[PDB]
Amino acid sequence: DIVLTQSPASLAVSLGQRATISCRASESVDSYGQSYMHWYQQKAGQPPKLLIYLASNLESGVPARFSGSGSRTDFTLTIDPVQAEDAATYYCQQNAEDSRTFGGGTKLEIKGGGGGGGDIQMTQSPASLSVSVGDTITLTCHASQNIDVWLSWFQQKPGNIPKLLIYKASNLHTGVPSRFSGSGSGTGFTLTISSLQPEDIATYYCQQAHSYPFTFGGGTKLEIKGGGGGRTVAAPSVFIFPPSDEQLKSGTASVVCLLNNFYPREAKVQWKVDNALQSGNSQESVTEQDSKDSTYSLSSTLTLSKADYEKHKVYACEVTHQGLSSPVTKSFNR
Amino acid sequence: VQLQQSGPELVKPGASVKISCKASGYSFTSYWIHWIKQRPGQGLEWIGMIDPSDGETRLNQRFQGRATLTVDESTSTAYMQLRSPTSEDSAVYYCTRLKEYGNYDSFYFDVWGAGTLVTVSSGEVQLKESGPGLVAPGGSLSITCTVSGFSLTDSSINWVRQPPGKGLEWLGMIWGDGRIDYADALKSRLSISKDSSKSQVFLEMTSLRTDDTATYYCARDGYFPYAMDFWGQGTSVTVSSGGASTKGPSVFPLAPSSKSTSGGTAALGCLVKDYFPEPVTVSWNSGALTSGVHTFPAVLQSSGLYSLSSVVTVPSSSLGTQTYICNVNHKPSNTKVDKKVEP
Amino acid sequence: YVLTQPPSVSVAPGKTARITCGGNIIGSKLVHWYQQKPGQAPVLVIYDDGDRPSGIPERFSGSNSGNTATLTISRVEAGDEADYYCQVWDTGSDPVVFGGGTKLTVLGQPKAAPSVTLFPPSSEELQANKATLVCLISDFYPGAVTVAWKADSSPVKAGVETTTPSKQSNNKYAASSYLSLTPEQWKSHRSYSCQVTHEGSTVEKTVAPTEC
Amino acid sequence: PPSTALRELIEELVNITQNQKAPLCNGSMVWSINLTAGMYCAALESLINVSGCSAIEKTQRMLSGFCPHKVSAGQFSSLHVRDTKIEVAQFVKDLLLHLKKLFREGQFN
Amino acid sequence: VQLVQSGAEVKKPGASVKVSCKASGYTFTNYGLSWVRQAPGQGLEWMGWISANNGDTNYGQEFQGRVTMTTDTSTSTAYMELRSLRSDDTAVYYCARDSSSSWARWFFDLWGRGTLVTVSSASTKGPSVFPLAPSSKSTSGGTAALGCLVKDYFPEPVTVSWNSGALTSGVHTFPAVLQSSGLYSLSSVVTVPSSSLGTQTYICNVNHKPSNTKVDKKVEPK
């Protein structure tokens, strides 16, 4: 089989220069006046994409930077100028025989930083903070480059239009209450939002106004958080399930009862193996705080064998929980 | 002082859609019309800027050639004639201008219309991949690429491979007539076949070594000179140590309570067991079920049954039960199952 | 160049007759055709495998499929019973290489008993010291003859002449046999005969010098 | 000699259309072209729209070899030829016959 | 339009022959003649081509050297001349219109009647005429058949009549055999009605055009 070599195997070139990626063939590849060489563009985790066919014909949706040439033995992929979005590994490929063979690959990237005209970027935290209602929430901000005068403080309701709060990083907008103030000069800023209200539970963003393309911040969001006592405490909705036929026909039987909705987490689940309790193979699957009403869901998967069930006519799982005035027995029969 | 944006705009692949956006309450041809892509699934993004007094546009990097703005100073309409769209373009595209006070002192974004929702319609050429990611060394690895939108009789599919970090390597192809090719390197341990009825193409491999760990694509060839134009995403393949759990979880059906014995709502589930490694993806009604759902994080089981992990999940619905069918996704086995509940 | 077409094709009247020139890559070359009737100049029928010139009937057509070209004549008529020569072009030894010949064996009429007669030499020539025994056969079908000069039931191969049968008005066949002898041989033996057999049918007469 | 490439193309064309082969491309029809003594570009731009079939690759290769500029199909005086549809077999047989005629006529390029 | 050749020809071994073929009915200058031979009872064989515009010739390996071709533009007649003839060269030499292209040889459409050129070592000897008498008389109810045995004659052809063309009922002319001595022999027999026995006489009329031997022979039974 024919083998194709490239030079260099990896390349780093800054912006504004002219790319030059050569693909050398072990022999000649032309056939009937035309050479059957190709190129491809593969980004990080992205699939390839045809760039130039016949090594001299560009594809649709391809910038004018691309250029191909060569005479039956060499093929240079010429991109000019060099852009940041062009940083993708290329692969020269031939189909001039019954068995194709891709080249050695040529990873391309930008050397010495370089940017694309001040590629500002904001990486803030957290995305969802634990804050109650009626308190001051101090958000965080972190930019990449220095501006010191231009970083807007936007705010948007989940599923609505955005609203600007502070301009010039120090001056308050037109119509914004005094409970919201933005501060910061440089890269890492800090937001000051006091007296959190139901209409203040929304998303928060940022954007700079120094160098185009004007980039926008990552985003801080908040939906709901907090839980009282008996209000969140719910009576445990007990659920039980008979053995599954797909397991019974296999020779064993794993039985489990379900505590669907309750609060708090402290619910000591037990079991009655035909009115007999035993602390053995009884796991405790715990869920996080419910996203609907801060309740909980636990299901103790009492894994056992079909013999352990085919002789015990009843399996009564017992739970002791704060939402239970008296332990509500959940039991199926057979 | 506001902007009348358009509404939903269904876009086809390659369809150069042109949305509408009208100004009112001021002079449309005074300040630079700004374009900002919402992209709710990612955050907030930029598009470019253009002054309707001269039409000059300063588009973004990705939107330099792909996007095409327009400013009509005679009818107060800003066309967005973006061409060759991708799946990342299905989002809302707000309108605004260079709202500025004091001779380019405070130029901000306070006006925000309804937002032009631009949802690029799905249903493109589907280069779907299906294959287990983990197999024991020495077994018979199999992958099945699925393609919809046309038939295999009028196209050809290739099997390109790429080791992690390494470069591409052609490893066979198959045409619509019935010809099959193989790379001269792995011509022995490799085999390809197709099935135009199922619209799928197979792949085999003998004596899988650890070096065989690589992503397996399946690309489509266009017309003459029969280069590669379409590209799927590829299912991962890893071979590190022979795992005895070469099978996904045997889904145990757990029918909910009867319609007459439930004082409250009725919730169903399916006990997952006999699967390794973690995790396994489980859903209900092919994802068409979200009310009262609860997923229990799986925990490594006891040493009595190989300690096969077990995940539990349960949706809660009101009596009586609707058409509810389980849906499971197990990436180590690539097996898909389903079952309806019957109390 | 080399072309090997079947030297015989037997078809029934009214059907479609197939005549192929099965040889090398003649399909990559313009295969012409030529029909020649017995006793007439060959005429052009098919050239370029799909172009009939003026005057040519419409039931004629030629095929060409890679390693094999074939002539397609439908509605077999006895009036077109002749020989067809596949002709091609080439750039090797000679620019034109004709075929081996294919005689269209149209099933005109069934077997016909031949008309055989034999005559002794003329007494005037016996006076001139020579002797020629002749055997005349005509009106048989098809064109196949087996001649055997058996004087006194003994085959004779010395001074025996016979030609291939030929055509005539009623489309039957006619062939003559010659036996060159000497007067003393004619006068010596007891009986002289000439045997003709067509498709295993023995038809033979005999004369004698004691009366003739 | 210039008469070598045309002879090789004729051999390839007669080798891919022989009756021992399956139906070429299996039914996908091809737009006919005007037989105008030099249909190289026409045949190229009318067979450029046959997705695969793996059996007419070398034919297209040699056709592009004879027509290196691959001039667009817009040269046709009537796009009706690009509107009438015939199977691959008929078009390739007519192309082979006309090419044999052109080769016998001495015209190579 | 029609291509015409000369008459028949008869030659001896080692001699030479120059056959003609005249073109009438088209522009001879825009075409080239081509010759094709045909051995009796054998397939065709390309012999030679010549053009009427430049004068180029081409021959086959069998005939490369042993033949010479020329054409006269005055009367539009070509002259294929064969030398050092052999015994097997006996064959009709047709002529046909072909393209004057020195590179290719197209089909043949115009086909002249041809010209038979026999090659034998025998001399132009007159025919020995003998009558054919029936040893046994005509069969009862059946017709008779008598003729003339033409022995040791050469060359062809010989026409045979009966009663100076007065009888044409049942005449049959069989092809001429060729004995080992090289002299052709023929025997034509007319199917004579038995009703004409005895009363009506019969006189054969053999015409040997080569030697002008006009001989009438009477026939009578035993």
Numbering used by the authors:
A (entry chain B): 1 to 334
B (entry chain A): 2 to 344
C (entry chain C): 2 to 213
D (entry chain D): 23 to 131
E (entry chain E): 2 to 223
Sentences from the paper on this structure:
As the biochemical and biophysical characterisation of CODVIg in complex with IL4 and/or IL13 clearly suggested high affinity bsAbs:antigen binding, we labelled the CODVIg:IL13 complex with a second antibody which recognises a different IL13 epitope than does CODVIg. The cryo-EM reconstruction of CODVIg:IL13:RefAbFab evinces electron density for CODVFab, IL13 and RefAbFab. With an overall resolution of 4.2 Å, the CODVFab:IL13 and IL13:RefAbFab epitope-paratope regions exhibit the highest resolution while the IL4 binding subdomains of CODV (VH2 and VL2) and both C1 subdomains of CODV and RefAb, located away from the IL13 binding regions, are at more modest resolutions, in the 6–7 Å range. The reconstruction obtained shows that all 3 CDR loops of CODV VH1 and CDR1 and CDR3 of VL1 are in close proximity to IL13 with higher buried surface area (BSA) compared to rest of the molecule. The heavy chain VH1 shares twice the interface area (564 Å2) with IL13 compared to VL1. Within VH1, CDR3 participates strongly with a maximum BSA of 312Å2 while CDR1 interacts the least (BSA of 92 Å2). Here, Asp155CDR1 and Ser156CDR1 interact with Ser73IL13, Arg180CDR2 forms hydrogen bonds with Ser76IL13 and Tyr227CDR3 hydrogen bonds with Val72IL13, Gly74IL13 and Gln82IL13. VL1 makes only three potential hydrogen bonds with IL13, namely Gln34CDR1-Arg83IL13, Gln34CDR1-Ser86IL13 and Asn95CDR3-Arg83IL13. Notably, there are no potential salt-bridges between IL13 and CODVFab, contrary to what has been observed for IL4 binding to CODVFab in the crystal structure of CODVFab:IL411. Importantly though, our reconstruction shows that the CODVIg IL13 binding site (Fv1) is oriented ~ 90° degrees to that of IL4 (Fv2), with the relevant antigen binding sites more than 50 Å apart.
